[PDB]
Every structure is written in structure tokens, then in C-alpha cells.
Design brief:
This is part of a larger assembly, with chains A (47 residues) and B (452 residues). Chain A is mainly α. Chain A has 1 helix and no strands. Chain A has one helix at 8-46. The longest helix of chain A has 39 residues, at 8-46. Chain A is rod-shaped, with a radius of gyration of 19 Å. By secondary structure, chain B is α/β, with parallel strands linked by helices. Chain B has one domain (1-452): 3-Layer(aba) Sandwich (Rossmann fold), CATH 3.40.50. Chain B contains 13 helices and 18 strands. Chain B has helices at residues 130-133, 154-164, 185-197, 215-235, 248-260, 274-282, 311-319, 328-331, 349-352, 362-385, 393-410, 420-431, 444-450; strands at 5-9, 12-16, 26-30, 36-44, 48-53, 66-69, 75-78, 86-88, 104-107, 125-126, 146-148, 166-167, 175-183, 204-210, 239-245, 294-302, 323-326, 339-345. Chain B is elongated and about 85 Å long. The relative contact order of chain B is 0.12. The chains are: A mainly alpha (47), B alpha/beta (452). Chains A and B meet through helix 1 of A and helix 10 of B. Chain A: This is V-type ATP synthase subunit D. Chain A: Produces ATP from ADP in the presence of a proton gradient across the membrane. Chain A: Belongs to the V-ATPase D subunit family. Chain A: It comes from Enterococcus hirae.
């Protein structure tokens, strides 16, 4: 775990960072699934 | 008269050889030099009674001092001539005006309203704020607080709401009961200077309790205001608006009293009976069946460390219908008032907004601008995660909506009164950016009526 001082204020801040982290993980994998779609049509054509 | 002082521990003192003493009874210390100091009973026993002196116990000689028991608690000299007069936390005059002959003397505690006698609040209140009147509508007789923080402009907003509060077509003027609880002399002067400069003092009765005043003085300050607001509304039939700030200093005053009685605190170092203490004050409001008057309470509290799970805002949310939440992020960008509507809710806004109330498009545009902001805010974040190239033609409008809604809708100014008509029309202009296909909550019958 990342080093931090235990506080009520730090708890809510790390709570907001994880919620944005979890959604950002959702969006980057959507870009990963998307790139796999335009790559696959182009790759088969190149092959 | 008693000259029997046994123990004196700080501002607290004990007086033996007592009888018939009551709790929260007013006492009066006669010092050896003739100086007179007052006190309240924090604890009574058969052979002794502890009291806290307001002015303190500095320089008091136990052997040559005396104490007088008045036999009555803190009562308010209520009268109708109080309009325009400013008192302190104990009802003493502060403006050095003419004396007020009390019509009655009522104890500041009050009485519990019968829940079946309580009436439904039905009248809309135009606070002049677009973020409130449209998305978090206040109703005449509602408990709607303002959750602020240390450093957030809650004083400017408190001076704006009481200045811009009015009822539509009622032909009767709103009554304002402002109660400053433990605020600084600067913030107190800001409130007093704003009520006098705008003529709102001609409609208001102000109670002013400073921060350096005793803790027992802070506890009675809300009880002083609500007892007068109870009298103006329920005894005279007036419509009363009650405003209180800061509410947190009232809780800290309970802690100094609770620790003075050696009571073990509850959650987070606060007294256990706080839920009863806050509800006793917050529920002295609402319209009454058979009476034309009404009491509207708007508490203002600053959350410690901006925590919502803190006992002060956690219990207030359980007692009051909704909450108005201010955020530090909106204030550092220049949004005045910095009122975030996403975490703010109004538990009685459905009756306040509609045909006859405000306009037919009030409920629909509220739900439309509400979802348009959450989608516009996530689109702006999508431009930060996936870049602007991932944003489509529709997403570029949603990101432009949120940015304008932050800067043009909510950001109106602490001295800007917007009518309900000017508020709704602005929402349509901000919603006119998105195509109709985006606006799904609003039916096309009213969408083809107001959309420019």
C-alpha cells in the first residue's frame, strides 16, 4: 500500500481517487477493446 | 441570599446550604467588591448546587462572596416591538435603542409540536438563487440546512438568502429571525451592516452571540431565536424565516458543558443526547393546522474536515428535509455561490414547483438539467482520460454545457436576485445547446413551448 497518514480526511480523498481510478480503468480497457477492433480488420488486410 | 461558597474550580463554582434549587436556574454572584456576575445551574444536589458564571470566577473570594438564586431559567421578554431590534445571546439589548416592555415571559425551551397537528408546507419560497429555487426548492415551513465549511463563503450566502427571501403574490411580508451563534465580531459586523444597509433590518430580529462569550451563552442563543420565532409565527400569524450560523459552535458549547458535568462523550467526542438536542431545535418549525403562521428554519453549519459522516451533519441530515452543500472546489474557481447541486437534495421540492406554484416546466427542466450536468461532467473527464478525439459531436456539447452551467447558471453572484422566471429561462438557454434528441426527460408538449 502507498504510504499515508491515517486520517478521516485522507480516507475520503483516497475514496474519491479509487472511484475515478475504477472508472478510468473501465475507459482505458474500452480503448483496448476498441483498438482490437480496428486493428483486427487492418491486420487481416495487411496479412 | 446565600453567602456560602464551598468549591470554585475554574469558571465553575458550588454553593452549599441550598434548597428548592432547580436545573438551569439563573443565579447572581455578589462579589466582595460589589461586582455582580450572573450564572446558570448546571447541576443541583440536595445540599449543594454547581453553577457556571458567565463573566467567570476571576478574582472571586469565596469567603466574602454571595450568590442569589432567581428561581427561574433563561426567559425571553417577548413583544411585538422587537422588530428592528438586535439583541445578544441572552436577550440583552445591543443596538442601544429604546427599551421593550415584554408582552410575556416565555422560557426559551419551547414545546414539542404534535405531529398530527403539523400541516403540509405548500407555498414556494423564491430565494433568488438559481441553484436553490430551481433544483433544491425551499418550501414555506421546511427544515433545509446549508452544509458549508471552514473558509467557504457561507456568510455572504447567509446575507443573500435573508435579503432575497420573498413569497409570491402573498401580499404579506416575510419575517426573518437571524441568530449568529459563536461567530467572530467581524462576521457579526458583516451581517449587521448588510441588514441595515438594505432595509432588511426593518423586517428582521437579530440575536448576536459572539465567539468569546460564554459557552452557556451559545447554548441559549438558538433557544432565544426559536422562542421569538415561535411567538411571531404561531401567536401572531406571521411567516417566519429562521437563519442560524454557525451551528457547529453550538455543538462545541455542549461539549464544554458536557465535560463540565464529567459526561463521557458518544460518537467522535460529542455528547450522547445530541440527537435529542438538535431535533429539539430543528423541529420547532412548520405550518400548524388552524393557524396562518409558519416557521421556516435554515441552519448553517461548517463540517469539520469537510466530513459528511461527522456527527453534526450526519444527525442534521436525519432531522432536516434535505441539505444544501457547498464545495471548496467550486469556490476556488470563482463560482458564487459555490453550491453543488449533485450532493444537494430537497425532500419537499415536489410540492413547491409546478403549475400555480412556479411554472409547469419547473419539474421537467430540473430533471433535465440535472442529468445533463452529470453527463457533461463525465464527458469533460473523458476528454482528460481518452483525449478530445474520443469526444463526439454530442459529447463536445455536453462538455460545453457543464462548463457554462458552472460559470453562468450557478455562478450568479452573492448580490444577484434572480426571479423564478429568469431562472427557468436561463436553464432553457443552457439546454438549447444540446439537440432535442439529448433532451429526453422533457415531453415534446412543453419542449415545443419554451425551447428557443
Amino acid at each position: 500500500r502507498l504510504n499515508v497518514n491515517p486520517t478521516r480526511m485522507e480516507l475520503t480523498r483516497l475514496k474519491k481517487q479509487l472511484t475515478t481510478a475504477t472508472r478510468g480503468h473501465k475507459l482505458l480497457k474500452d480503448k483496448q477493446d476498441e483498438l482490437m477492433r480496428q486493428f483486427i480488420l487492418l491486420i487481416r488486410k495487411n496479412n | 441570599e446565600y453567602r456560602t461558597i464551598k468549591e470554585v474550580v475554574g469558571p465553575l463554582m458550588a454553593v452549599e446550604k441550598v434548597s428548592g434549587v432547580k436545573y438551569e436556574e439563573l443565579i447572581e454572584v455578589r462579589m466582595q467588591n460589589g461586582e455582580i456576575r450572573r450564572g446558570q445551574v448546571l447541576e443541583v444536589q440536595e445540599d449543594k448546587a454547581m453553577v457556571q458564571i458567565f463573566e467567570g470566577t476571576s478574582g472571586i473570594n469565596l469567603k466574602n462572596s454571595s450568590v442569589r438564586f432567581l428561581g427561574h431559567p433563561l426567559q425571553l421578554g417577548v413583544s411585538e416591538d422587537m422588530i428592528g431590534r438586535v439583541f445578544d445571546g441572552l436577550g440583552r439589548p445591543k443596538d442601544n435603542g429604546p427599551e421593550i416592555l415584554p408582552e410575556k415571559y416565555l422560557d426559551i425551551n419551547g414545546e414539542v409540536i404534535n405531529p398530527i397537528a403539523r400541516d403540509y408546507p405548500d407555498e414556494f419560497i423564491q430565494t433568488g438563487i438559481s441553484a436553490i429555487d430551481h433544483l433544491n426548492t425551499l418550501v414555506r415551513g421546511q427544515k433545509l440546512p446549508v452544509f458549508s465549511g471552514s473558509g467557504l463563503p457561507h456568510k455572504e450566502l447567509a446575507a443573500q438568502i435573508a435579503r432575497q427571501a420573498t413569497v409570491l403574490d402573498s401580499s404579506d411580508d416575510f419575517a426573518v429571525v437571524f441568530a449568529a451563534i459563536g461567530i467572530t465580531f467581524e462576521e457579526a459586523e458583516f451581517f449587521m451592516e448588510d441588514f441595515r444597509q438594505t432595509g432588511a433590518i426593518d423586517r428582521s430580529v437579530m440575536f448576536m452571540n459572539l465567539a468569546n462569550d460564554p459557552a452557556i451563552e451559545r447554548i441559549a442563543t438558538p433557544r432565544m431565536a426559536l422562542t421569538a420565532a415561535e411567538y411571531l409565527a404561531y401567536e401572531k400569524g406571521m411567516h417566519v424565516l429562521v437563519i442560524m450560523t454557525d451551528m457547529t459552535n453550538y455543538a462545541e458549547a455542549l461539549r464544554e458543558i458536557s465535560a463540565a458535568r464529567r459526561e463521557v462523550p458518544g460518537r467522535r467526542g460529542y455528547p450522547g443526547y445530541l440527537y435529542t438536542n438538535l431535533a429539539t431545535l430543528f423541529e420547532r418549525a412548520g405550518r400548524i393546522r388552524g393557524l396562518k403562521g409558519s416557521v421556516t428554519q435554515i441552519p448553517i453549519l461548517t463540517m469539520p474536515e469537510d466530513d459528511k459522516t461527522h456527527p453534526i451533519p450526519d444527525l442534521t441530515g436525519y432531522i432536516t428535509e434535505g441539505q444544501i452543500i457547498l464545495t471548496r472546489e467550486l469556490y476556488k474557481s470563482g463560482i458564487q455561490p459555490p453550491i453543488d447541486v449533485l450532493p444537494s437534495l430537497s425532500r419537499l421540492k415536489d410540492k413547491g414547483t409546478g403549475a400555480g406554484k412556479t411554472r409547469e416546466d419547473h419539474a421537467a427542466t430540473m430533471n433535465q438539467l440535472f442529468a445533463a450536468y452529470a453527463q457533461g461532467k463525465q464527458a469533460k473527464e473523458l476528454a482528460v482520460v481518452l483525449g478530445e478525439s474520443a469526444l463526439s459531436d454530442i459529447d463536445k456539447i455536453y462538455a460545453k454545457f457543464a462548463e457554462r452551467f458552472e460559470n453562468e447558471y450557478v455562478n450568479q453572484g452573492f448580490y444577484t436576485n434572480r426571479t423564478i422566471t429568469e431562472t427557468l429561462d436561463l436553464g432553457w438557454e443552457l439546454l438549447a445547446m444540446l439537440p432535442r434528441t439529448e433532451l429526453k426527460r422533457i415531453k415534446d408538449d412543453l419542449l415545443d413551448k419554451y425551447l428557443p
